[PDB]
UniProtKB/Swiss-Prot annotation:
The keyword Transmembrane helix does not apply. This is Small ribosomal subunit protein uS8. The gene is rps8. It holds the Pfam family Ribosomal_S8. Part of the 30S ribosomal subunit.
Length: 129
RNA sequence: GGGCCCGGUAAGUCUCUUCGGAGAUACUGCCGGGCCC
């Protein structure tokens, strides 16, 4: 069985970043994945990225910039309250002071830091440091 | 068998609460469609 779309996207990025590649093409291109990439971008973890129409689910061309040390999907997508992030930050960001949790809120996908800044709880979907 | 999208829902979930419920709707689920492999 194939790995879920988002997990898959984060795995490829992770590795092509490690190997030093300057680009990666992510196959399944869901709105969710795009939304997650937007967060990683706004946080300086990846460069430009674009949707490439292919008649299927689409494709994401992501510009890597050697800013990622590791990233992946969080499974299951744990629910988190407005003040329950710390517990998760210790669990997925091995490095204190570095990284973000990407959470899905009723107001959209964003970093846990913006979710807190807004008093929103949500679903954990990934980590990046 | 797998995946993408649209509309609906609001069980899970999040927020608030007079703690009865109310509001929200991204994710999961559910209903109805479109489509790709």
């Amino acid at each position: 069985s194939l790995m879920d779309p988002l997990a898959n996207a984060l795995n490829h990025i992770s590795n092509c970043e490690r190997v030093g590649k300057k680009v990666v093409y992510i196959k399944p291109a869901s709105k969710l994945i795009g939304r997650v990439l937007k967060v990683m971008q706004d946080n300086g973890y990846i460069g430009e990225f674009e949707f490439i129409e292919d008649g299927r689910a689409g494709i994401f061309k992501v510009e890597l910039i050697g800013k990622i040390n590791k990233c992946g999907a969080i499974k299951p997508r744990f629910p988190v309250k407005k003040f329950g992030y710390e517990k998760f930050e210790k669990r997925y960001l091995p490095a204190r002071d570095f990284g973000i949790l990407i959470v899905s809120t009723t107001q959209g996908v964003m970093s846990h830091e913006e979710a807190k800044k807004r008093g929103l709880g949500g679903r954990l979907l990934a980590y990046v440091y």
